[PDB]
Amino acid sequence: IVEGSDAEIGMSPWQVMLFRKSPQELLCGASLISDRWVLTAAHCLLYPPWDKNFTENDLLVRIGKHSRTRYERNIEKISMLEKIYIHPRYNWRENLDRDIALMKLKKPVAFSDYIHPVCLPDRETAASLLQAGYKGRVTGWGNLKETQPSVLQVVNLPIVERPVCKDSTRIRITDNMFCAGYKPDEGKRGDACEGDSGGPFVMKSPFNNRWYQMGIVSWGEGCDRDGKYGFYTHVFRLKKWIQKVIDQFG
């Protein structure tokens, strides 16, 4: 996260760290959506241009974390993956369309002060909140600039108008993506960056005061560049797939 701040304790208790077993290192962010399901970006798991293709046994999930590097005794919980599910129309060849994947945990995780799931939006919440100018929050342990934090970083970013999203890049953008960030004239800045991939873009509904995950950190050209924006997987647009998987693999 570029130009963010340290998180408060328990501020994002759905934040998940995707961790590589050997060599031990951060791979990506993710989110907790129930006691056994974690949501992430497909590109975290499968990206053939970079020879990336991880299997269940290559990884672990670390939940309830604050510190990036520290092993957070009596607080974080480490979970093994039972099964990875990637969107069958994930477009790794071109633009990361449908950049989404589910991970099923071997055992249920125990909820605590620091571990708690985020909600996924219904159609009406998405229609009400995904408006240009409305702000969400993105969280992660990735880089602080484009060429590492001690603790989880947080940044609030406004949703950008689709024409501005489109005109900021040569990449083909789809209805399964949205972009967020400040315009050059807006002064303020911030963005996701490398290692923030797969982490949640959340909004707090003013109707029921619950946090909803509207997006997944997906792609960006550079990090926190003027005139560029971060792109997010549109979770509501892929919800039908999410429910099929969960409805199918319990």
């Binding site: 501020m11 959506i33 708690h116 702000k135």
Partner: peptide, 28 residues
């Protein structure tokens, strides 16, 4: 779940975090 999106250290205790109001103010 039934309790999703309600943080134990914040919404469940009726405590606000330091910047959540910036989001609310944007929801116009």
């Amino acid at each position: 779940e039934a309790d999703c999106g309600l943080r134990p250290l914040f919404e469940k205790k009726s405590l606000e975090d330091k910047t959540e109001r910036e989001l609310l103010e944007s929801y116009i």
